């Protein structure tokens, strides 16, 4: 009765999707999900909801990625947001947070791409709180998403705690191998540019602040570059970091190389 | 602002007299102008002056929209800044080309001038006339060698009448997919930016594909350019191709993009507002009525606009307090 | 009596002779046996052709004296080629082309594969002057050599100017591997020799003209040719032209036919990435190239981030088996930068030349110390996180699809018991259990089980990352001492049971601890097993390796065994006649590997560093410290039916 | 240091051609060779001068240079009582 209902429910998605319409085809697998909800299925509520939630993520890149609208008001995030809700409620009660966790990566995603950086940062953090006890490296990736989404949203003090806590977790679970030691470079520079653009009173500078600002006041170019800039901008040089900025150009990534700007911009 | 004003106008006064347009390609070729655009121009200490006014008429032309009648530009200086800001933009490819990075806060203070002279209705009088063709040309150009020289990695490519006005409008048309894919923020295209560029390099975009140069060719997909369609264009310039035919348009994807190009360019003098009006009824097989909708939508919001009013580039859209 | 070499001279010459009949089928027939017989070629014939007088030794369209195959002092390839070149595909007056009226474009295309494997036997004929004496000077005013074959690059279809790429590739390839890497030495023998002005360097572009080219056909020759070419170009005194090809490959990687696609990243996985790290090292104007790009050249990380990760996701199987196996041919060349052992990209190159040229448990796991490399752990788990996250962060099918497989075989290739700092993160933090949380809930989905060629991989990978865990962890499930992995191993065993539960529903025709009546996928798993038997018991094709239900139940046996090596008696007592009816059931089907888990059921019933470190100084101290040393009850059924299937 | 009997002998100029013509191909070899030629007393500045190039880029020869110096360092190292190579490799290797 329910199980063919839905089969038809099925067909109906998988026609809509031929037609290629996508509002209404989402409704369908929501109705799929309903009547797996009705009986006891568990992972196949699941998938009928993620492919609801994939449906209406598809229909804002088709109304403001492909079709920049300016009518464009975000009606199918909100469904998203709640399918993907209900989604992960339903994993969290069947317990596997992995696929919980994946979900929080593809809606913060999702959100990164609409141009929405502190959502992204947001479910980015939930997703790496959700992928601490099983996979690590899976959480430092996700924190470092976030990092990347709160730098781009001029959050920088987050991005401090987070590069600070993506340091840490890389130590405890380095102790490095392999990718933890690009986490760690990674940290290592960018924590050093995010103290030199905010330069915390000794109050508000924790002792992890303290030991690496004392370490420099990693390849060996670019860390001599580093101290050379720190030892710079203690002294106020301001045509020694103009030397440093067209000779660090090439060795940063766009991320560090914003954050450079941003050091060589509040100094003069 | 005297003194900028005064210093601005003695940098023009130190250029050339008859301006040539910028090929990064094969610049040393053509001319002996070269010889003199290296000689007065090539010096440090002209090229340590140039991007401090840069810095001194993006900061005045922030302020110019805010201020008294006493304190805007005069008329006369307005061709000397749009002269000012084509030698500005050239100082920056042309250290692209030869030295290293410029300064990469040069880079800033050079596209802040460019893109708060391209938009003030002024010195967009001054750009989009015909005097000024080579010049805007010069713009096109180095505007793209800047985003090529950062954005896109050796072996890439950005999204996967004389020769420079055919080449710098198919340019543009590049530009504005790189829009699409290049320059969003947040998109994994976008790793390469560093992100202090992409919104004036966004802004840079949208307001040099609206010249009349651009805009005819910009509208047009280029699913329609790869179909046989091809008339001959005039409008004084190289480059005034007529409007799209609806019979191109009933196709989905190259409708589309033309709904893409329309609303990230948005409208001009108010006939080419009447001409697409024209066109996206004419459209009016279910999804392309669904598609021409929220065209008619989004024409609609774009007279609703409380500045310039179809000008996605300066102006956005008019919200009223309830409270 | 093995056969002689006048015989193979015989065929050689009865086949030049026949090039020459006139037909169409006989010379393509000829020139097809010329060249798979330039390509294979017999030893003792190819000793003869190397040779300078050749066939002397062994007997003691055309309008010049080309010389026959006879005469002495040159080799017996050199007038082949001048033969081959005059008689097919140039005319003896000028750099012009033959029509398609005259020779047709197959027998131009057999002929320049012929002369391209000729080449690559032996390169100075390339160089040869066309005609031995020369052609009527009052007809004809200069007299050209055999480099116009050269010009084909531009003659109208492909297979003609595809054919010209992979002539030059072997032109470069066999000049560079014929004298070793002295080219100006060489180049001064031969333009001593002959008067033709033909440099390397004025052959790189044409073939680089052949990668940017309209048909698939032609890039996918060029991209051959490039194969062939590359690395005996990019160790050489011409290593900026190599990677400049490097890079025009690199711009290739999305083209719309699937040969030219895993040609491509069957070209980038024979590099090493170190002597390539070396010469962006060295480079300052390479990493500008064209429009003058400031920044840095990043080709190892887009080689394996944007080219063979990315390819794990496309949509034809074939691709994502080629790009698992260009993960595995490039985790050992790739040089990431400032490891604690080599240094610089120069140590690494000279710690693989010297050393190289300087010197019953189950499958599942180890228990040695194991001496392990400390670079390639690193490069191991590089390429396993970069691998993780795009399976964990993966929005299609055919990605998770694909990287199942790419992790399978960097497991199977790469294992996880000895490389096991390579393969770890996170859990039991410190042999280790990597990652196997995330694979785990992929199988508890309703959406992966249902395809079966990544099922059985993800079943062979879970059974090693679990099993990985063996010396440290071991001392319900007694055995396992560690809590936190007690539940994992679980999921495992009981997913395994009702799989193996399932194939006995597939193999007796019956309509349907482990029990998949009142799961509603498992039952969709019934249906697809269901189809893919039936689909086998139709068709009669018995030497298949893939078959999707054979190698899936051997997979299904093969890590059910490697977990039952983990278990006890008091955890398997409640369960061993359910395993013994699921093989009595399964056994005619697949009995290879139906027997080793019987065996291993039986087992568990009965208790069972900067370049003068590693140049000389270290196999010089392990060469003295040599010398100091050298100074001083319900099996028997199922046994029975083993004996006779044995018999 | 003694010459092959009137040609009866592999001298060593030559089989030292054969290891110049090594350079590139095999550098692990050239480099035993090259501690063979420091153990005895053969310091002939012609040859270091070839091996060490004293006055893009090939690859594999650079090790040999590199190697070589190193090498010839350390026989510097050993005795360095005669003021002769620490002059002639501190004024040109630098």
Known sequence: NVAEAGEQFGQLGRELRAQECLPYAAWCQLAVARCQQALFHGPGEALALTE???????????????????????????????????????????????????????????????????????????????????????????????????????????????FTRMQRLAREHGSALGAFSDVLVRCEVSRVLLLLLLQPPPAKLLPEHAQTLEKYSLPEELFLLLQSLVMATHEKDTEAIKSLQVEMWPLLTAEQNHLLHLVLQETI | ??????????????????????????????????????????????????????????????????????????????????????????????????????????????????????????????????????????????????????????????????????????????????????????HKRNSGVPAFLTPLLRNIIISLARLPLVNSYTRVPPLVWKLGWSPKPGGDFGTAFPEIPVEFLQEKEVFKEFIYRINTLGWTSRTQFEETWATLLGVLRTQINVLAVQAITSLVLSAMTVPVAGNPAVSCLEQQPRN | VSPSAEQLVQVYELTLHHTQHQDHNVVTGALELLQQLFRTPPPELLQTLTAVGGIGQLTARIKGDIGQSTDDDSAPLVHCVRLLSASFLLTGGKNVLVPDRDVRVSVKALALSCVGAAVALHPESFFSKLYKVPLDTTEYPEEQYVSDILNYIDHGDPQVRGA???????????????????????????????????????????????????????????????????????????????????????????????????????????????????????????????????????????????????????????????????????????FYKCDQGQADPVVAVARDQSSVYLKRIYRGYNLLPSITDVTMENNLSRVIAAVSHELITSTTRALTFGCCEALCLLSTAFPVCIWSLGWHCGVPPLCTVGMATMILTLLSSAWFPLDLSAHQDALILAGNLLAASAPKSLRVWPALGDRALVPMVEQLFSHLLKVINICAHVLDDVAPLGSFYHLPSYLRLHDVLKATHANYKVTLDLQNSTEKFGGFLRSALDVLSQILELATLQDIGKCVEEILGYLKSCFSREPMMATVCVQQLLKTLFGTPGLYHYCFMAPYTHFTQALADASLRLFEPLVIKALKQYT | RSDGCGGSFYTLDSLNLRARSMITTHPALVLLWCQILLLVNHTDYRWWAEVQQTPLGMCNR?????????????????????????????????
Request: aromatic share 6%; with cysteine; proline share 4%.
């Open chain 3, 164 to 334: 010209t790429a992979i002539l030059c590739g072997t032109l470069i390839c066999s000049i560079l591997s014929r004298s070793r890497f002295h080219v100006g030495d060489w180049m001064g023998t031969i333009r001593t020799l002959t008067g033709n002005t033909f440099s390397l360097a004025d052959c790189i572009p044409l073939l680089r003209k052949t990668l940017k080219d309209e048909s698939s056909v032609t890039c996918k020759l060029a991209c051959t040719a490039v194969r062939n070419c590359v690395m005996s170009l990019c160790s050489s005194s011409y290593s900026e032209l190599g990677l400049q090809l490097i890079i025009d490959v690199l711009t290739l990687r999305n083209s719309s036919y699937w040969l030219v696609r895993t040609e491509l990243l069957e070209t980038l996985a024979e590099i090493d990435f170190r002597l390539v790290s070396f010469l962006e090292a060295k480079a300052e104007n390479l990493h500008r190239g064209a429009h003058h790009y400031t920044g840095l050249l990043k080709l190892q990380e887009r080689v394996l981030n944007n080219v063979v990760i990315h390819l794990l996701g496309d949509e034809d199987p074939r691709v994502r088996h080629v790009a698992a196996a260009s993960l595995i041919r490039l985790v050992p060349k790739l």
């Open chain 4, 62 to 94: 650079e090790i040999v240079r590199r190697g070589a110096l190193i090498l010839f360092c350390d026989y510097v190292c050993q005795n360095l009582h005669d003021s002769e190579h620490l002059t002639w490799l501190i004024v040109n290797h630098i």
């Open chain 1, 52 to 162: 609801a939630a994939r449906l209406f993520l598809r229909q804002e890149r088709d109304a403001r990625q492909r079709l920049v609208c300016p009518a464009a008001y975000g009606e199918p995030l909100q469904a998203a947001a709640s399918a993907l809700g209900a989604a992960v409620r339903l994993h969290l009660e069947l317990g596997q947070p992995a696929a919980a966790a994946a979900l929080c990566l593809e809606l913060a995603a999702a959100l990164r791409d609409l141009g929405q950086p502190a959502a992204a940062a947001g479910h980015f953090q939930r997703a790496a709180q959700l992928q601490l006890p099983q996979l690590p490296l899976a959480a430092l990736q996700a924190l470092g998403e976030a990092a990347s989404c709160q730098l781009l949203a001029r959050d920088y003090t987050g991005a401090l705690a987070v």
């Open chain 2, 1 to 186: 602002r005297e003194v900028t004003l005064a210093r601005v106008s003695g940098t023009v006064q130190q250029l050339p007299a008859v301006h040539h347009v910028f090929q990064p390609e094969l610049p040393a070729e053509p001319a002996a102008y070269w010889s003199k655009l290296n000689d007065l121009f090539g010096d440090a200490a002209l090229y340590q002056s140039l991007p401090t006014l840069a810095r001194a008429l993006a900061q005045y032309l922030v302020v110019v929209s805010k201020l008294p009648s006493h304190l805007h530009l005069p008329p006369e200086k307005e061709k000397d800044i749009v002269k000012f800001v084509v030698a500005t933009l050239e100082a920056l490819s042309w250290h692209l080309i030869h030295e290293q990075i410029p300064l990469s806060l040069d880079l800033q203070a050079g596209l802040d001038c460019c893109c708060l002279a391209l938009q003030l209705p002024g010195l967009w009088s001054v750009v989009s006339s015909t005097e000024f063709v080579t010049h805007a040309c010069s713009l096109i150009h180095c505007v793209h060698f800047i985003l090529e020289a950062v954005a896109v990695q050796p072996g890439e490519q950005l999204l996967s009448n004389p020769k420079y006005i055919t080449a710098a409008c198919e340019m543009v048309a590049e530009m504005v997919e790189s829009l699409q894919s290049v320059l969003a923020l947040g």
